[PDB]
Design a protein around this ligand. Structure first.
Ligand SMILES: C[N+](C)(C)CCO
Ligand SMILES: C[N+](C)(C)CCO
Ligand SMILES: C[N+](C)(C)CCO
Ligand SMILES: C[N+](C)(C)CCO
Ligand SMILES: C[N+](C)(C)CCO
Ligand SMILES: C[N+](C)(C)CCO
Ligand SMILES: [Zn+2]
Ligand SMILES: [Zn+2]
Length: 178
């Protein structure tokens, strides 16, 4: 390529000054975003339609990588686009792209609730107390709802029931929980 960096500015193959545009510099094999002031975007987000991109230090577009911003982790896909509402390995990124921690996740593809502990790992084959109530997560992390777990009963919200009547449809009989 005959494209060249002159400080933070990029001259294109034809010698024109890049500005307000993406450039792909084969010398780095990297995308870069050149701002309206003809300087490359660096250590910043770029919104383009619905999509977010992150320009790292030196202006390289982030891609297939995790970035930390204001104490939150964001994943950029192969094309540089910030992932939203998805599992990225064992992590879940929410609506804003931020890795979910200490919170519920409803995933329509498993039709199941999950809980990501503060430590960033999904609850799995275990009891947790979440906001003062008890919830049991199966293998794979799926919240158990409306069933007996040992001597305990978890209701439709997944919360262990403390006391009261339950009509069990499995046994077609009334139980009193104390
Ligand atoms: C844009 N880079 C900083 C990567 C190259 C020019 O110095
Ligand atoms: C970065 N572009 C949006 C220019 C293409 C996807 O990588
Ligand atoms: C701009 N951020 C990537 C930090 C948030 C998008 O919801
Ligand atoms: C539901 N998870 C994505 C958490 C695991 C599937 O194997
Ligand atoms: C978010 N919760 C799992 C507690 C509600 C399920 O119905
Ligand atoms: C739970 N009881 C059977 C005791 C009353 C509701 O019909
Ligand atoms: Zn060249
Ligand atoms: Zn898992």
């Amino acid at each position: 390529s005959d494209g060249t960096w002159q400080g933070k500015q990029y001259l294109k193959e034809d010698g024109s000054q890049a500005a307000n545009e993406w450039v792909f510099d084969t010398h780095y094999q990297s995308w870069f975003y050149i701002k309206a002031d003809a300087n490359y975007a660096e250590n910043e987000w770029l919104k383009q339609g619905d999509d977010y991109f992150y320009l790292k230090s030196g202006g390289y577009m982030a891609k297939s990588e995790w970035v930390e911003d204001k104490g939150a982790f964001y994943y950029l896909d192969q094309d540089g686009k910030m992932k939203r509402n998805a599992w990225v390995g064992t992590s879940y990124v929410g609506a804003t792209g931020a890795k979910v921690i200490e919170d519920w996740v409803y995933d329509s593809q498993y039709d199941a609730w999950f809980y990501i502990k503060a430590d960033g790992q999904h609850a799995e084959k275990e009891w947790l107390q979440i906001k003062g109530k008890d919830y049991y997560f199966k293998s794979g992390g799926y919240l158990l709802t409306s069933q007996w777990i040992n001597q305990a009963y978890v209701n439709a919200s997944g919360a262990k029931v403390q006391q009261g009547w339950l009509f069990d449809k499995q046994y077609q009989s009334w139980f009193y929980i104390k």
